[model samples]
Target chain A: KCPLMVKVLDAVRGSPAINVAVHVFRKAADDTWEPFASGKTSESGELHGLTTEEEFVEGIYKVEIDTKSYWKALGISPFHEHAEVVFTANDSGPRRYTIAALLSPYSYSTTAVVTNP
Target chain B: KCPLMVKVLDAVRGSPAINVAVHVFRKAADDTWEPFASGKTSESGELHGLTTEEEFVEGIYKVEIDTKSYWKALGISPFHEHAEVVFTANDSGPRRYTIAALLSPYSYSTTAVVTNP
Candidate 1:
């Protein structure tokens, strides 16, 4: 299976959002978040190898993006403090995930693509 | 000074998702969801006039999309029950919101573009 991946696009500029910081956290049994991985978008707005299928266990995961700084770098003020997507993973079975996010100064959306091999 | 708008795209096809149904709901004081407006996407995958600025009072709103049917019609089964974006609107001042969604069989992402008049 492929590694967990992330892709980001800038809705305002109609292009890839480069150099955005992304952090991944896995919820602990007590419900506190523990850091799992982190990376920044490449030139094409994609990052891979955040986690391998063997390491991505069944649990709730959070993908947090540094959206405010991304916009602030462009001299714009964004609305959300940060953009995060929380979801349960591997409940159904072992699968691959690709998280896609679209960003704007005032809003951001994140989606997941899970597949089986 | 514009109405609430929705735009949808298909991630798999890299094209606009035509004819997706969108519903807007406002959370009532009693904590019940009150249907505010609804529409289907056009050829350009954009739907406008779900509500006017005068009618879109400050409140929490939910934009729900029928992603299941959209994917089913194309003969693919989707994973989500439905796609929903919930946010508080016009908390500080008057603004316009454009909700954008990207849909795939296994995931969807939504973002908002809020602008002041």
Candidate 2:
């Protein structure tokens, strides 16, 4: 089974992107994508259990962050609406997968966890 | 008409997150989301003309980021999948909305650029 976990933080202030929105999607055989799951970050800048053992699949996937509404409330603009993390999922080897990120008002870092071939 | 513009960058290094995947979605009346548009950031870390002055609607919207594939290439992990920016749309007042973000490996910043009524 594969698991997707999310962690968020501040780039400039060195804090957490608390309560930010998050999403997950998988690429289809025809190169299309559909939403798989979603949730919000906690005060610790984390989203647990985005996908379960039963939901694991092998394919291309994308992760999205909610940059617009989150920062808009703080009066920040010209920022990327969502920071994305795209990766491939497989059932051949890796057991667990994770996605992580860093955030600032103008920049972000998106990373993936899991061994690759 | 409504428009969505996306920009990406490395929050800590203060650099552009080039070639990052991005997506836009509109919330359905039943609180579901439907894909509206998508694209990637340029060398300048920006996604221009995402809506192309054609796609616009009034509803709840979310933006997605491909954080996995992007950072995995750089050897980072535990990143959030996507940073979501949930916002409301309307035709009653101000128009021309923009969503932006700042990202790092640990945290991210997502903001909106629209006049809310």
Candidate 3:
């Protein structure tokens, strides 16, 4: 099963946030962020193969979104420097996660759905 | 302009997440959370007046949503203990914020729209 997935939507235009940069970071034992994975969104505003079941071990993870750059590309000014979603992963057991984000020029929302694989 | 507002939607049903409880908290100087406001969603899944301009000063704020109960009421199980959106408010100047969330049985997403008022 895919351990982690990402979906991003543009709330202003009600479409997928294609070509947006995504970076995944895991908190090390020292509490410093270590780069784990990276990718960009597809035409459907989705990303796959961010992590595998084994690589995605139990720990805290952060998904960083380049929202400001995305907005600037469209000639819009955004509020946040970037968007970050941090959470504990696979705490109970191995699980599948879909981190979804809805973005507007002046707003963005992030949500996660975790399910047993 | 309303200082802080909330909007919620059910991803599974593709409708407004009506009647969901929203609680707002502001971090004190000592970094303790103090209950600042509370309300429930309307038929449109929106809540207003959670805070006023003068009260919502520059500080870290948290908006908590009781999503577990919302899913359980629909006979479904949720994953997260609760949904939280924490950020610094009015760091630059007075503004308006609309925190929107999209919810599913096993997933949730939170986004924000901050605008000049």
Candidate 4:
């Protein structure tokens, strides 16, 4: 098994006054879903250390963010209601992974990869 | 209306060997969607400057990622297969909005906010 760390980014474009929240989950061997970690974007539209590597194993995982609440906070109707990302890991050795997202009230994107140490 | 800037993050946990791709979109006044920007995660599981602030207007937006591909790159079965985030922005002024996401194979999360000058 291996540990992993996740970071969340809140990309607010075309406007000011926006807030965001992110949720993290893991996939068990039984093919069930489990909540692993969560975080919210700061005034700078960024969140680090949303999850630690110690909390994960060699397997697949998922992450999500709430678009409705983010838009509501800014008093704007949501154009994109949700955004998500999925990735995988190999526990052959100790390594680090970083997952980041770019989002707005209506749209979002993500990337995941392993690190060299 | 306001211009928005979004950032994408790749937060990988546990194991290692994962790659991610992100897609950005914009919402039109007619309630339609348009592709705005896109990026891929580096070997370090991170991607920056997915989109700039000058491309957006005061409105809602959405973003999506290819979770399946991210897991496939790591040679792991996608348990989550998808992750997303949603947020809002008010174009009352010329401000910088940053949106980010945290992702794995099964789950993900996000945040959005305005920045200080």
Candidate 5:
């Protein structure tokens, strides 16, 4: 496993947001996102994925979430249909990174934390 | 004059987001985002454009904002590169719609209000 964790929070409602679909992509040298893995935020507003089980290559990565569908389920018309976070996995070690996102009908935030063992 | 308005907000910063690039697109029958206009968030995270004076044809529309660039400028690595709002422009008359986005690094929300006079 790539040892990846993702969390979604409702910044507006200030609680764990459930049902946000999340996907991970590895950036190819051509500046394109190669689909890597997928999952949905659970009752805890979080999910786990390998990102990929292949030998880890150092490069840029992107996490995209389907906020449009989520809001629709919640009966909200979101201005943005999708949200994405892009970052460079510039290190190697324990191969652990955590991505946490604060989500709301209006805004969002994300962070990637690396654990170098 | 197809009277239109847009607003970008920093859900995390809780203030008007500035300098983010914004774009509008009309959905053609081909299911592609046809570029209409482009602008950047101003002092109050707001922008106004005609979408176009090319005459209004009823259809679907999209608004995309570059939140990743905004976070980069502010020294944050946003998870999402772009935020989008999609809606069907149904009805007629005054032909007014408002799109406001609350944006952060991880999540987003959008709303489109149409007023037919």
Candidate 6:
């Protein structure tokens, strides 16, 4: 089993009314993608959870989120059309990956890297 | 305007029955999270689209999805209870971030990085 962390932040300083939801996905050996988990930012604008005990394997994976609907709900115009993050997992040994993102009405940012314990 | 890509893969070589869906989210200034968009994989197990023309702003953002429902629909027990990917979007300038993931009954992966033109 492995540990993964996902953090979300809102960079819009003036915007007081906005919300965010993130969708999680995993890649299979058949070269296809499947749904595995999901989370939404809390009142603090962050969501974190652990992958299923059986789902944490080593391979290439991907993550994506819908930006249009999220912004529309707040009645605010969105600057970005969409946002996505991807990274690699080494199954050969025990490791941890930390995934984080920065978001605003106009743009977003992310990073995924191996961590040592 | 910036371009972002999200790709999902199935890692189970022998498993051919699986479905995936992705949900997107954006953070608000009040440190709250909200829902924005949603996408499901095609027969090929991939879903790709552009973010809203106005939704992409400059700040920290996050993405997540529901995996249990997706896998249950296929009558396959998901190996992972959940999956998440987080990345950064530099609103400082024009840049593109590609987010992707890999999945199977046992594991998943992903990455996100800035690209220059």
> Which candidate has the top score in TM-score?
5
lDDT of 4 by residue, A46-70 (tens): 5566655555566666666565667
Supply fnat for every model shown.
0.27, 0.18, 0.27, 0.34, 0.25, 0.02
Model 4 lDDT vs. the true structure?
A: 0.57
- Output the worst ten-in-a-row residue range by lDDT, candidate 1 chain B: B77-86
Summarize candidate 6's per-residue lDDT along B9-108 as a digit string, tens digits. 6555543223567776666778665665667656665555747435666655665645546666767765444455544455666567666565554445
lDDT of 2 by residue, B1-117 (tens): 235677777866678988888888887777667888888989988887777544576666777777556777777862455555655665566566666677765456566666542
Query: After superposing the true interface residues, what Cα RMSD does each candidate give?
Result: 3.8, 6.7, 3.8, 7.1, 5.3, 9.4
Q: What is the lDDT of residue B77 in candidate 5?
A: 70
lDDT of 1 by residue, A4-109 (tens): 7889999999999999999999999897889999999999999887887677887777787878789889998676546666666765765678888888876666
Q: TM-score for candidate 1, please give it.
A: 0.57
Candidate No. with top lDDT = 3
Recovery fraction of native interface contacts for candidate 6: 0.02
Classify candidate 5 by CAPRI docking class: incorrect
TM-score of only chain B in every candidate structure: 0.96, 0.83, 0.95, 0.67, 0.83, 0.75
Q: Per-residue lDDT tens digits of candidate 6, residues A49-81?
A: 747536777665665656656667766766454
Number of the predicted model whose DockQ against the real structure is largest: 5
Candidate 3, residues B15-115, lDDT tens digits: the string is 99999998888889886889989999999999987777788898878788878778878987665545767677798999888888888765666667878
- As a whole number from 0 to 100, the lDDT of residue B64 in candidate 6 is 64
True contacts kept of 3: 0.27
Binned by DockQ into CAPRI classes (incorrect, acceptable, medium, high), candidate 1 is incorrect
- For residues B12-107, what per-residue lDDT tens digits would candidate 5 score against the true structure? 889999887987788877876788778887898888764653454566666778777888898877655576665555434436777777775655
Ranking of all predicted structures according to DockQ, beginning with the best and ending with the worst: 5, 3, 1, 4, 2, 6
